[PDB]
């Protein structure tokens, strides 16, 4: 419904994603998506990272978080790599990160970290071409507290694809986040958004 020639600030990508949700609205899918994401966030908040991989993450996953370079709104000639990958993980790479979290020589995890996730603005729509692919959009606030007085708060929109896998369980097959802050003021981005 958006025309990006008129709505000058809107990217083609964003206009495409909008279109998926404004058409076929199914209140039931929205509810299923809310449950999936709330359960995922609970597992992550209690640091059940193995459980998260087992129950929420698909074997063919791409888990991607980008940082886009600041360019002029009117830029048209400079064509070099627009973004870097903070995360661009397959299942094995996620597993490595999970093992790193769980290793008892991960000194930064003692004392235990505290995570609290807030998931909002859930939207869900089935893919037009692949009847088994569910598109889910949601926003997250992630609060990380450690070592008495360190507090880091992360904010992001997540563009996901979820598909039924082993046992008929819907699992994450793609997560894409375009991280909104260019220069991070949270010490690192070592959290699963």
């Amino acid at each position: 419904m958006i025309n990006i020639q008129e709505d000058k600030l809107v990217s083609a990508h964003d206009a495409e994603e909008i279109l998926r949700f404004f058409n076929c609205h199914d209140s039931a899918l929205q509810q299923e998506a809310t449950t999936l994401l709330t359960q995922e966030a609970h597992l992550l908040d209690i640091q059940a990272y193995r459980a998260w991989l087992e129950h929420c993450v698909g074997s063919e996953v791409q888990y991607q978080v980008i940082s886009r370079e600041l360019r002029a709104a009117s830029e048209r000639r400079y064509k070099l790599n627009e973004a870097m990958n903070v995360y661009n993980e397959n299942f094995q790479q996620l597993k490595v990160r999970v093992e790193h979290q769980l290793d008892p020589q991960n000194w930064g995890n003692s004392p235990k970290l505290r995570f609290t996730r807030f998931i909002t603005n859930v939207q869900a729509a089935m893919d037009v071409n692949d009847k088994e692919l569910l598109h889910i959009r949601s926003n997250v606030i992630l609060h990380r507290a450690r070592r008495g007085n360190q507090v880091d708060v992360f904010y992001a929109a997540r563009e996901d694809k979820w598909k039924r896998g082993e046992g008929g369980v819907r699992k994450l097959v793609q997560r894409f986040v375009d991280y909104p802050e260019r220069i991070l003021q949270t010490h690192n981005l070592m959290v699963f958004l």
Binding site: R71, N81, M84, Y87, W107, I183
Partner: protein, 447 residues
């Protein structure tokens, strides 16, 4: 504090006062005697290859615009309008023939010149001397095989001479490999540490790897993964350490071409590096060809660090005594296959980027060490860098610089800090030279 006389770094670089990582007055003094005096990393040719391409960079706490000129050279200018001082450019990269100020519309060329002023004839008539109102230019801009550095001090040594003995070690990868590309954009993250904490860690700290990074070594299954938890000390002869007159230094871990990369990339890298080394043996000799495919952990004084082979490239941008803005790029060899360049770049960021699982291991180390320099009972305490002292040599027949022929030691810390003392206690380059006339003798004492 009288920096002419205050002993911040003891003789031979053996120790440093902890306050150096916390003292704000010293930080201000370093802006003058370190950042305004020395060579600082700006960008790479690969990031501004065409006329009009530009990027912004920090030099100390100053921001500069770095621009490819029509004649193929690069010039850099303060990112500050000459009228009322607004920041001129608000983006990180682009292509343009000039920059217009959004306050009053003054327009400057890519060459820094003041080219236009709105309504000049009606307002200024002929009174405005535009030729004296060009952007404030960075005096010196030089390239080391495509890596572009800047220096505000016209009296500085040429970049090549400044690299001193470290240049010999970098050349196999920077020059003889066919050349490197920097893959942007960088990751950018602020840490609550003094810039010297990561600078010293990268210049000479192999000791921490097995313990600090126990979990990353174990989990990633990379080539240096035996050391996890200090399970094993590398063999005698597993590498060496070196330092130089102007402060740059590095560790060498022989043959570790796959570096911190996880098992997924190890076979392909070890194959690629070894094949190139075979060709280089005939060109630069066996020792230098082996250096090419050896992991170098280096700091180019003051605040640019790298891990060759791993392909990590960092700038520790100073904000205040306990704040640094970390920029992380990937370095790749130009003749690597594209798909390999992409995977290596992603792996650099996976390990050492904003969500780098290795880099995260160092967070607490750097932050608390730095913040403890502010604490009253620790200000006058001595940070120790004596490991290997009295076993370093200079003028070796095979390996140049002040060299410790051991993989793990503090040789490079001592040379970084002797250079730092000399600068902080000197008013100009001539005085630094006078204070450094017996640099290597000081570093090899007791041998």
């Amino acid at each position: 504090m009288n920096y002419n006389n205050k002993i911040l770094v003891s003789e031979s670089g053996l120790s440093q006062k902890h306050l150096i990582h916390g003292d704000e007055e010293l930080f201000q003094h370093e802006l003058k005697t370190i950042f305004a005096r020395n060579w600082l990393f700006l960008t790479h040719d690969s990031l501004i290859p065409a006329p009009g391409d530009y990027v912004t960079a920090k030099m100390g706490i100053d921001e500069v615009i770095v621009s490819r000129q029509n004649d193929g050279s690069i010039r850099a200018f303060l990112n500050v309008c000459r009228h009322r001082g607004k920041t001129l450019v608000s983006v990180e990269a682009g292509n343009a023939k000039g920059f217009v100020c959004s306050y009053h519309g003054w327009g400057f060329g890519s060459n820094g010149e003041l080219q236009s002023v709105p309504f000049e004839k009606d307002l200024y008539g002929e009174s405005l001397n535009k030729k004296c109102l060009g952007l404030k230019e960075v005096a010196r801009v030089e390239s080391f095989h495509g890596f572009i550095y800047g220096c505000f001090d016209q009296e500085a040594p040429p970049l090549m001479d400044y690299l001193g003995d470290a240049a010999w070690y970098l050349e196999p990868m920077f020059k003889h490999s066919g050349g490197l590309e920097l893959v942007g954009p960088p990751g950018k993250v602020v840490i609550k540490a003094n810039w010297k904490a990561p600078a010293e860690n990268f210049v000479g700290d192999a000791y921490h790897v097995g313990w600090t990074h126990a979990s990353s070594l174990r989990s990633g299954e990379s080539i240096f993964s035996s050391l996890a938890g200090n399970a094993a000390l590398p063999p005698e002869g597993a590498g060496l350490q070196m330092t130089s007159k102007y402060g740059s230094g590095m560790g060498v871990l022989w043959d570790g071409y796959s570096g911190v990369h996880s098992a997924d990339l190890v076979p392909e890298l070890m194959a690629f590096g070894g094949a190139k080394q075979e060709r280089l043996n005939k060109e630069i000799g066996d020792v230098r060809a082996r250096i090419y495919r050896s992991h170098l952990n280096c700091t180019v004084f003051p605040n640019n660090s790298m891990l060759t082979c791993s392909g990590v490239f960092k700038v520790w941008n100073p904000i205040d005594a306990n704040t640094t803005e970390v920029w992380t790029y990937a370095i790749v060899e130009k003749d690597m296959p594209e798909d390999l360049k992409r995977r290596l770049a992603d792996s650099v960021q996976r390990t050492f980027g904003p969500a780098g699982f290795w880099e995260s291991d160092d967070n607490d180390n750097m932050e608390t060490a730095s913040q403890n320099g502010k604490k009253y009972q620790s200000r006058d305490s001595d940070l120790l860098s004596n490991l290997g002292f009295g076993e370093d040599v200079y003028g070796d027949a095979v390996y140049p610089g002040v060299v410790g022929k051991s993989a793990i030691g503090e040789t490079s810390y001592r040379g970084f800090y002797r250079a730092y003392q000399a600068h902080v206690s000197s008013s100009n380059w001539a005085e630094f030279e006078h204070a450094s006339s017996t640099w290597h003798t000081e570093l090899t004492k007791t041998t």
